[PDB]
């Protein structure tokens, strides 16, 4: 009834669309720890016993999955872990030498993808130099009959450690305390713009870091309908992402079996190559169910008519570019496949199909990751036949007729993380209160309801990779003590509802009690009061020291 | 009423725990155990506890493992900036060494060709190696160039030990034990909390501990297992014996350049006539000490005739006495000392010949090694024999395990994690053995200690301590007892947990005894207090707005 007097609130659901550091949470079980992985450390903390999710009500937030923070953070972290895993492994320094190559002639027949190359190379004994003969792919070998390695222009080659594996391990990207990841329950949401009901998670489902071009593999499945994601309908340069309604089983193989030959370069260092191939040479086939593929592609066509109307649409093979862009490039079973995806999107097919669509593929030892210069890996030849069954669960297209597009490893991380957003809980709020001195459950709910449910938010707020985890920890400590000592300078440290001895001001706002505590939300409230937070803080701590010194003087007789 | 729940923050309680540990070198800059180690505090504080008994296992100590890892870290950080002599690996023609004054059996000059700092032409380099390092193929090669590679020591840095004072991070304490007669294993009768251990020299020795700690009263022997021959036996001698070692000749030093910015140090021709390198000990002192040792072995290990025999055999680092004299490693054949019935005249010193080795493959690791630089001129060393290492077979000397070297000095200390959170019924660490009613006076003193790449390691330990303090504060806030030692009333104590009577709890037992009595159930009461604070908080919320 009297004049409005201030009250501070610790733990009200509030956020700002912010940026922060996120720390990995690798899968808990031990066999994957044994199966050493480039993508996932063992130092990465185990996943939670219960991956937890809670759903909000009456809240709508804007998501921009094109400009979201998971994508940058995952790209940087995955490059860092790549470099870390490659660092101990040998640098194949004496590889970049002239080579005498001729096409490989197996005892059965000739191979199109291979040439036997003899060259001279200096070993751990510098005096000894002798001829060394090893196989090499045609794609990786650049001509000058004398060939050299393609990436001798870019960098000295680094061998992948056969100990470590390229297999995608689910990474639970998890945020420090004081930050909460916001998911969108709307299955049909295009990923851009508002989402009508959202969910708060302490951390995300396990995301597989999977390199793929022109298609998405082992990705998430749209539960209701096939979905299109578009940065800009008008602009052609932007990228179109198809999230597929249902999986399209892709079966890939290298039919032959490969023999690993080791050559010593250093003490405890060798270069691994493929020897002679056993068995009759046969091409690498990545075949897909044809009726399924046709029905799906046509469902893409039907769904896509709405977002670009009254125009004939034809999927066309990509015109040209580097092999990572034009051809579907991905790794399964520890080897790199590059598959001509022309036949899948070829307009030659007139809708008639009865048996598996076949795609020839080629395999490359030397790969430049993330399109960077300065780095180049040597894939050791996996021994035996590999046969990997994967799910086609998404496509990458671009308008000039829509063609497949590839090479943007950032977009693979975009396609999985379309729904998650970092938000920084700024737990401090200011408002008048009835009782006047002399996780995120109640976001959209009424203000008094949040005043009751403040305890849950407080409880959750209470509680370079090693350096990254340490950074997350100390950020939690610094934020916690920042808030606690600000409360101490406000007079109610350890109390969530800090009734204050300070009057409110008409200048800050003239809103009535019913308006703020019935209709306005904490985000709307922060919008109203966000311009005057500093001044209220300073004059509140002034009021505290004034009151305390007055009480000390009155205490003194 | 009956005794009901009460928290006690900062009371003396320890569980036998493992935590991280950091170096602290000497404060003086004369030695300026590299320099990145923090300087020690002026006063290593030590406080003896009354009525407290702790079971020290000399062989299941965590700090010996942490010491091994940390000193490996020191050594690898030292070696990493230094040069890697990978190009040294060439075929090597060799020939015996004939100085102008006499001939040497131990040596050979070898001639070999490399590349200059200018990247095309070099010239013949004739440098001198021992017979122990080189391996024939009459063309020779270094000992381990195929399986491993050799990392030259930085010529500036020296390998002599500096005393490291390991200190417990905040919330953790080191517990020395002050019983003088003690065999490492089992209870020790009275103990002392120490902020940091006494400065341990990272000394490398085999069969004869050097520059170590002295037995204060009598020669004391420790056992890892009486009934089994594998497990090792420690001897820690009272008084001492001077071991006096020399390098008789003058070896030149020749700096040969490998490439631009890389140079390694060989010897070149010797000056003076070659004399066998050797080390001697006083005969009478050795005989007295060894007779005492045999008598002690008779005393503890009963009824058996005990005899000392030389080491059986193996690589020269195994059978003999390895040690770093004057920044150079030698290996002294101990056929003189431990062999009985040689019938020494006892007036002359007992003399052991020694072989100096260039390439040191220590730390029980393959794939990494050192080319110790040849120090110029004579070297003299005069050190103690403060302990011996033997095994049951007869009793024979052994070596090669640096973990045992680190075991010998740290036999007194054990780490303990102070958990301030003491939960009891109710109506620096000196008062641990005292009563709880008396020990609650001094809980503030233990509370004080909770606050007070190796930079990153000690930062991680400090952050561990910080989040430990904040875990304590977080738990007390979840219980509502935060910021204070003793709380209010009205939370009952379930009888099933413990059965002692009201009066005898305080006076009779120690805090550790109560911890053992109450250890299992702690999680249950942490839940019941948690939910109690929640429901009381709900009631207090009903009180907050009236």
């Amino acid at each position: 009834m009297g004049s409005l007097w201030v009250t501070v609130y610790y733990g009200v659901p509030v956020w700002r669309d912010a940026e922060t550091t996120l720390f990995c949470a690798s899968d808990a079980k031990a066999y994957e720890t044994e199966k050493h992985s480039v993508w996932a450390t063992h130092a990465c903390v185990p996943t939670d016993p219960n991956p937890q999710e809670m759903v909000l009500e009456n809240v709508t937030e804007n998501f921009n999955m094109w400009k979201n923070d998971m994508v940058d953070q995952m790209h940087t972290d995955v490059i860092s872990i790549w470099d870390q895993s490659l660092k101990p492994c040998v640098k194949l320094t004496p590889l970049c030498v002239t080579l005498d190559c001729s096409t490989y002639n197996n005892t059965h027949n000739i191979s199109k993808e291979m040439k036997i190359c003899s060259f001279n190379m200096t070993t751990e004994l510098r005096d000894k130099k002798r001829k060394v003969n090893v196989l090499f792919y045609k794609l990786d070998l650049v001509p000058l009959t004398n060939y050299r390695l393609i990436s001798c222009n870019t960098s000295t080659i680094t061998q992948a450690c056969p100990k470590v594996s390229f297999d995608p391990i689910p990474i639970h990207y998890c945020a420090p305390a004081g930050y909460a990841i916001l998911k969108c329950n709307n299955k049909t949401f295009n990923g851009t713009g508002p989402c009508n009901n959202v969910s708060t998670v302490q951390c995300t489902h396990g995301i597989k870091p999977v390199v793929s071009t022109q298609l998405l593999l082992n990705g998430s499945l749209a539960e209701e309908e096939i979905i299109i994601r578009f940065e800009n309908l008008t602009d052609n340069v932007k990228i179109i992402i198809v999230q597929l309604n249902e999986t399209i089983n892709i079966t890939c193989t290298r039919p032959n079996n490969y023999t690993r030959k080791s050559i010593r370069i250093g003490p405890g260092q060798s270069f691994y190559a493929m020897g002679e191939i056993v068995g009759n040479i046969r091409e690498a086939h990545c075949n897909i169910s044809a009726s399924k593929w046709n029905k799906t592609l046509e469902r893409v066509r039907t769904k896509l008519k709405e977002h670009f109307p009254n125009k004939t649409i034809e999927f066309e093979p990509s015109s040209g570019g580097d092999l990572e862009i034009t051809t579907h490039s991905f790794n399964c079973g520890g080897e790199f496949f590059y598959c001509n995806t022309s036949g899948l999107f070829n307009s030659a097919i007139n809708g008639t199909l009865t048996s598996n669509v076949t795609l020839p593929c080629r395999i490359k030892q030397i790969i430049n990751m993330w399109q960077r210069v300065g780095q180049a890996m040597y894939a050791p030849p996996i021994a035996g036949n590999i046969t990997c069954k994967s799910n086609i669960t998404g496509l990458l297209l671009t308008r000039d007729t829509f063609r497949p597009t590839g090479g943007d490893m950032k977009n693979n991380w975009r396609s999985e993380l379309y729904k998650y957003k970092v938000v920084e809980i700024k737990p401090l709020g200011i408002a008048p209160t009835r009782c006047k001195r002399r996780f995120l459950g109640a976001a959209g709910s009424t203000m008094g309801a949040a005043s009751m449910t403040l305890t849950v938010q407080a409880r959750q707020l209470l509680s370079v990779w090693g350096i990254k985890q340490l950074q997350a920890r100390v950020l939690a400590i610094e934020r916690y003590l920042k808030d606690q000592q600000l409360l101490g300078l406000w007079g109610c440290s350890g109390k969530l509802i800090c009734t204050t001895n300070v009057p409110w001001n008409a200048s800050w706002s003239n809103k009535s009690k019913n308006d703020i505590w019935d209709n306005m939300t904490w985000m709307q409230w922060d919008r109203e009061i966000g311009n005057h937070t500093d001044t209220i803080y300073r004059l509140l701590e002034d009021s505290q020291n004034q009151q305390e010194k007055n009480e000390k003087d009155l205490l003194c007789l | 009423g009956s005794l009901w729940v009460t928290v006690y923050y900062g009371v003396p309680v320890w569980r036998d725990a493992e935590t991280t540990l950091f170096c602290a070198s000497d404060a003086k800059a004369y030695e300026t155990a590299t320099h990145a180690c923090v300087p020690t505090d002026p006063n290593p504080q030590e406080m003896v506890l009354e009525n407290v008994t702790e079971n020290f296992n000399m062989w299941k100590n965590d700090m010996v493992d942490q010491m091994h890892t940390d000193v490996i870290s020191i050594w690898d950080q030292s070696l990493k900036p230094c040069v890697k002599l990978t190009p040294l690996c060439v075929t090597l023609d060799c020939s015996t060494y004939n100085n102008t004054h006499n001939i040497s059996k131990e040596m050979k000059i070898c001639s070999f060709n490399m590349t200059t700092e200018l990247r095309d032409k070099k010239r013949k380099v004739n440098v001198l190696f021992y017979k122990l390092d080189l391996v024939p193929l009459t063309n020779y090669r270094l000992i381990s160039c195929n399986t491993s590679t050799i990392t030259q020591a930085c010529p500036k840095v020296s390998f002599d030990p500096i005393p490291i004072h390991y200190c417990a991070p905040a919330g953790y304490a080191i517990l020395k034990c002050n019983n003088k007669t003690f065999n490492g294993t089992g209870p020790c009768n009275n103990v002392s909390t120490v902020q940091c251990t006494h400065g341990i020299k990272p000394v490398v020795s085999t069969q004869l501990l050097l520059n170590g700690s002295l037995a204060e009263e009598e020669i004391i022997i420790r056992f890892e297992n009486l009934t089994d021959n594998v497990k090792i036996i420690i001897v820690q001698l009272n008084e001492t014996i001077n071991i006096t070692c020399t390098r008789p000749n003058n070896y030149t030093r020749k700096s040969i350049r490998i490439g631009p910015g890389q140079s390694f140090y060989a010897m070149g021709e010797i000056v003076g006539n070659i004399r066998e390198a050797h080390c001697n000990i006083s005969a009478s002192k050795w005989n007295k000490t060894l007779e005492r040792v045999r008598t002690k072995l008779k005393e503890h290990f009963p009824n058996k005739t005990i005899e000392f025999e030389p080491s059986s055999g193996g690589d020269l680092e195994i059978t003999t006495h390895s040690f770093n004299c004057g920044g150079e490693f030698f290996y002294c054949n101990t056929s003189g000392l431990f062999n009985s019935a040689i019938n020494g005249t006892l007036t002359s010193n007992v003399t052991l010949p020694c072989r100096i080795k260039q390439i040191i493959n220590m730390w029980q690791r393959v794939g990494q090694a050192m080319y110790a630089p040849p120090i110029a001129g004579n070297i003299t060393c005069k050190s103690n024999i403060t302990g011996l290492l033997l095994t049951r077979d007869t009793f024979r000397p052994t070596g090669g395990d640096m973990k045992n070297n680190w075991r010998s000095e740290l036999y007194k200390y054990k780490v303990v994690e102070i958990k301030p959170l003491g939960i009891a019924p109710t109506r620096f660490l000196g008062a641990a053995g005292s009563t709880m009613g008396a020990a609650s006076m001094t809980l503030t003193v233990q509370a004080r200690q909770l606050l007070s790449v190796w930079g990153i390691k000690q930062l991680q330990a400090r952050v561990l301590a910080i989040e430990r303090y904040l875990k304590d504060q977080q738990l007390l806030g979840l219980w509502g007892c935060s910021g204070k030692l003793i709380c209010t009333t009205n939370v009952p104590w379930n009888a099933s947990w413990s059965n002692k009577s009201k009066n005898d709890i305080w006076d009779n037992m120690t805090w550790m005894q109560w911890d053992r009595e109450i250890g299992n159930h702690t999680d249950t009461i942490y839940r019941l207090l948690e939910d109690s604070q929640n429901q009381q908080e709900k009631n207090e919320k009903d009180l907050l707005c009236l």
Partner: antibody
Framework: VQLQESGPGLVKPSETLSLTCTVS????????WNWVRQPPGKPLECIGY???????TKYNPSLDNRVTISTDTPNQFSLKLRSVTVADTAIYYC?????????????????WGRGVLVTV | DIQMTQSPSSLSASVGDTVTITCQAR??????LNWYQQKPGRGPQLLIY???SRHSGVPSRFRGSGSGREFTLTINNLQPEDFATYSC?????????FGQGTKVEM
């Protein structure tokens, strides 16, 4: 890679012994090639080990002045022993020490052959 | 040459065994131990390569651990294929000796 032994079913005492091990899967690598004899209910024992194709060889002084390792063809590597004795009767095997750090299995007999029993 | 021992010399149980080993000679060889499994009348194959972690192919049931003279191998949740011999091995010097052979049955 698959490894297999080859030799005589029976030897007589005081007669020379020979054995040949075959790496079927691929050519003879640069890894360490080993013979690991298993005596009847007693610990296994090394004989002569060669670092690849025509590399240096380390033999055992426990079986002094009898062992020899030599290679003939890129898929065969052989052991030869002279002046055998009755105590040598055992099951022989061939195996491979992984000298290099990053390969799965390091300084370890990774792939062994099935082995052959010699009576002597 | 190094002498080698194992304990128990021949165990007999199904699930949860533990093969401790004392290998004597110069103790604390490092992490330079290699376990093996030899099926009856068959070639042995690798289990643990540094007393550290499992080899490729051998499951997580088989593990090796310990530094110092007290190297150890633990097998958990044994299946019928698990029952076979296991031996100590060194890595320092050229003659790598083996343990007498710890046997597990039933």
């Amino acid at each position: 890679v698959q490894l297999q032994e080859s030799g005589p079913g029976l030897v007589k005492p005081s007669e020379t012994l020979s054995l040949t091990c075959t790496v079927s899967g691929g050519s003879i690598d640069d890894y360490f090639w080993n013979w690991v004899r298993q005596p009847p209910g007693k610990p296994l024992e090394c004989i002569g080990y060669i670092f690849g194709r025509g590399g240096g060889t380390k033999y055992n002084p426990s079986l002094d002045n009898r062992v020899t390792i030599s290679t003939d063809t890129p898929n065969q590597f052989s052991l030869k022993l002279r002046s055998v004795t009755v105590a040598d009767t055992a099951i022989y095997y061939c195996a491979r020490w992984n000298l290099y750090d990053d390969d799965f299995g390091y300084n370890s007999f990774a792939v062994w052959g099935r082995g052959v029993l010699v009576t002597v | 040459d190094i002498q080698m021992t194992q304990s128990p010399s021949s165990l007999s149980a199904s699930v949860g065994d533990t093969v401790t080993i004392t290998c004597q000679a110069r103790h604390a060889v490092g992490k330079n131990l290699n376990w093996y499994q030899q099926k009856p009348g068959r070639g042995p194959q690798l289990l643990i390569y540094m007393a550290s972690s499992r080899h490729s192919g051998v499951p997580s049931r088989f593990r090796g651990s310990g530094s110092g003279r007290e190297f150890t191998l633990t097998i958990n949740n044994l299946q019928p294929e698990d029952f076979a011999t296991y031996s100590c091995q060194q890595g320092y010097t050229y003659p790598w000796t083996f343990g007498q052979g710890t046997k597990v049955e039933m």
